[PDB]
Design a protein around this nucleic acid. Sequence first.
RNA 1: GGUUUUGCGCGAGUGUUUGGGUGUAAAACCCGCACGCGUAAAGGUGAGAGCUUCGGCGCAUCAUCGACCGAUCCUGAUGUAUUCGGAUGGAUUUGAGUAGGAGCGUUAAGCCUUGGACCCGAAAGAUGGUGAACAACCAUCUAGUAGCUGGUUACCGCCGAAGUUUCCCUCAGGAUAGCAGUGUCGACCUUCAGUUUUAUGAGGUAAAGCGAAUGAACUUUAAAUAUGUAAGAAGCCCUUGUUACUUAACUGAACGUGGGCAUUCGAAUGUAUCGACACUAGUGGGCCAUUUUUGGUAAGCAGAACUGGCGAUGCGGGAUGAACCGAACGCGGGGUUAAGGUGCCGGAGUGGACGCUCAUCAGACUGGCGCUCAAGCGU
Lengths: 52, 126, 129, 50
Amino acid sequence: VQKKNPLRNKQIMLRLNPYASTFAKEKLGEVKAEEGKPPKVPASFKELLHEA
Amino acid sequence: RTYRVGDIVDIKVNGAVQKGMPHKFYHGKTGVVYNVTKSAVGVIVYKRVKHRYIEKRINVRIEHVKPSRSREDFLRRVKENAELKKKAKAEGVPVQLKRQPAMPREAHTVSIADNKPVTLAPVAYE
Amino acid sequence: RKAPKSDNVYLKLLVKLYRFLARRTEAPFNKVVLRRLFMSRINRPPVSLSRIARNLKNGNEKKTVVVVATVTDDNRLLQVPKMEVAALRFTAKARARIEAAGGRTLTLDQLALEKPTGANTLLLRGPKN
Amino acid sequence: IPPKPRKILQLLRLRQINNGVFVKVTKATAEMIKIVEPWVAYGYPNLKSV
RNA sequence: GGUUUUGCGCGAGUGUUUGGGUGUAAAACCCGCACGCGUAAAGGUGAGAGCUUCGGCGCAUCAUCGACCGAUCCUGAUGUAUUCGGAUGGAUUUGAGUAGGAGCGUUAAGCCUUGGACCCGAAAGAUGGUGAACAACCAUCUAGUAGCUGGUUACCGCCGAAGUUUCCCUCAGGAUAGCAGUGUCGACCUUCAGUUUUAUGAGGUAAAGCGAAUGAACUUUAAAUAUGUAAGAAGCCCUUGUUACUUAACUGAACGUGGGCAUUCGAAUGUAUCGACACUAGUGGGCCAUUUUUGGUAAGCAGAACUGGCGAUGCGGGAUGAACCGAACGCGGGGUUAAGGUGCCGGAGUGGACGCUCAUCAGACUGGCGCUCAAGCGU
């Protein structure tokens, strides 16, 4: 009788998607990147960028 | 050239002989033969008007009419479809039969080695 | 459709009965009978005894003939076979000739009670124009 | 609207203004939407939009 | 008086009401002989609703192959009164023919013809009378008739146009098809499509190259731009006989062959569906704009096809209109925009960045007031 927005109503989202509770609980939307020292940009790429 | 009754025939209309020439709306068209004479040939050709189609029966003689090369794709397609379906049934493997509409390209890498990019400007001054 | 054009109240009774049947059974026979009950008189031409006698030939002599129209007598037919016919109306000579041959005469409600789904029936239409 | 682009827009289920459809990017469909470019706006959706 | 459709009764029959009988008396009830109209004087195969004991049986209708008849074309039997007849085998035969009847009567609605004929509206003409004094008037036929005007009476809902193709002949026009609608039949997202894609048609048209040849007409390649045709089951391929056809000849065509493909059954996307048959109202203007093409003029302009609109359209903008831009309409509340705007009239910025312009009637993506490091112009 009345369409309820799952993005506004959390119970409707839990009805359609049972994973929403543990998606919010385990913070899979704030996942961090892989750890370790990132390498530096190659000089060739930099000399190609600032060409004539 | 010899023409049957019921073959798909396309017309191109040259200016060599002006006898029995059709209008420029029929220039370079395609139709189906229902009538063959000593010289002329009766062809049905479809015609657009507003919202609908009217068939028109027109007479062109031999030097502008020729058998069309639109249908041979149908016969070659049915022949290959039958033959690779026979090979698929013999070998017991699924194979692709339809025509695909050419999906967009996938991902790949291009090497900068031996292919150093050149820098250009709107005008080619040299 | 939504209503029959006939003003016969018993025709509307048959229409209600076969609406219920068509709704509550998966029998195409009831739907065809309801469709022909909705139809007009010119679209329901009379079926003669000779046309039924022709169609009752191979293995249909034990089947019940169903005609959504009026069965008329045919003078050309000299011998009337034994026949169980269910129709809207029977002319007096047609009914008398059917019952004199040992056959039987039915209305559509007796058919709907004896054969609710149309098992072993022979649906016959009269000639068009 | 000319009859041929209107036929394209009826084939794409776009018969009203501000109407959205998902189309698989296919060269046939690509040519259709390049035909009706003067009436539509189209692009690549992300996961949030879908 | 015809004709179409809905209802009803009876049905190969149907219709009592000219009339007779009867009556509680113009009612109702009954019907003897006629008469009108109609009827009389079952084949195979393939689809096909429906049924099924799952083996099949198959309505109506359609296609195809056959059968019979009025009559027509030869061959011309036994026979014949001796000048009559048509038996057998053949024809590209027809028909408002047969092949298991559908009509009669009535009611309601629509249309057509004729009567005053949807209402009102000439000059006339004829018949019979009344007067005068150098044709006129009166009554009737007559509600005459022809064109052409004016008018043509409650509401709401649903669906909704055309101003064109072709033909014939009067000029003073109709018919056919188209647009709108109704019924029946057949399938049913099978199928269909103002569409893309694939192959294909006329443009190799532009371009690039000719350190390839050759010379826009050069081309390896190849645009742009529009428009026809085909995309399996109503299908494919090949092999073999027949034919009335055809050619030197299965050279092809048609009728008989066979096979396997229903789990990509042979692109995309849409599919609130399409085809046929039958029946029924209103309409035959032109104008503007675009694309392509031809010709002329001092310049405008003239001739073709094309779609979109107007006629039959309200709303927001557009200085009124109109064109043009947006967007197409049940009654309301809220939110957001399009085109256009935010100095005031007028709802919303005297918003921001960069420059230019002082015009003795600047300029305004000005209407008025008015504006000048704008309230002008370009981003």
